[PDB]
From a paper:
NAD+-dependent protein deacylases (sirtuins) constitute a unique class of enzymes that are conserved from bacteria to humans. The human isotype Sirtuin 2 (Sirt2) deacetylates both nuclear and cytoplasmatic proteins and thereby functions as a major cell cycle regulator, a determinant of myelination, a regulator of autophagy and a suppressor of brain inflammation. In this work, we present the first crystal structures of Sirt2 in complex with a potent and Sirt2-selective small-molecule inhibitor with drug-like properties.
Residue numbers in the entry: 56 to 102, 119 to 298, 305 to 355
Amino acid sequence: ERLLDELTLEGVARYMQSERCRRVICLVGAGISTSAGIPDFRSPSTGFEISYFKKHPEPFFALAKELYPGQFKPTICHYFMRLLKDKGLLLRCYTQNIDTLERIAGLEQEDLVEAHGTFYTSHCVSASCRHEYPLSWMKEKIFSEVTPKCEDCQSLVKPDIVFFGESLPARFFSCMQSDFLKVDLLLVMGTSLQVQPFASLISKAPLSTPRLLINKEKAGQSDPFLGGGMDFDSKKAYRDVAWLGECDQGCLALAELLGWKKELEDLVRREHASIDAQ
Ligand SMILES: Cc1cc(C)nc(SCC(=O)Nc2ncc(Cc3ccccc3)s2)n1
Ligand SMILES: [Zn+2]
């Protein structure tokens, strides 16, 4: 036996509206922001060291200028997660993204683990100072071409993203240890689960916990070359479901099953109208 009555989006929907599903964790990757016009900086079709950065900041900040999104308009997928929040279902959103769209969509700091950090804030890098600066400040420096320095001590100011050489934020490990004792459903969206330790999260779910992947391609299966993992398609499969396609399409399909399609359309068009109007 198993919590899902069938291993399909329809079975997940039925589970989510049952008394067994109280607490959803979303795991999200670059797949959820590509339809917002932000390309996945790993993807080859699209176009890093901390020690290097601290001595020669100029290239990172040049590259930052080049890749700075033209607008910050979250996706159907982002507002889907806001909808989980409004309906009391969202325990946490673990994101690999640095684009701040989760926050613009109305996820709060408490709801979020920015596993790879974020551009939302920046800090002076001097240990004895660590002055915090907002994105508005950082954006002005990136666009005005001026290499960002601290007003208090003149040290370099670095966006709060995780560079190679740096460890993931402490919050990632401390939330992981608690959240995955509490989870009823993992929603994995727009990630190929290629980056560690983020990808190890799927193995932290309780054995019974259904795991729904919404992604352009099947991901998370065990590597036949090395080796738990996602099992979608064997006779042993009992809880993992793959919905292949664009993340916005998959969340729309799931909202529709849930009876949330009108709420999600209304939320999205309202928030898009607001962002468009400046
Ligand atoms: C608010 C905002 C600003 C910018 C520039 N972008 C974005 S969202 C897009 C983005 O991928 N920008 C990047 N800037 C520098 C990058 C290189 C890199 C360095 C260190 C670690 C990983 C990658 S990747 N949002
Ligand atoms: Zn400083």
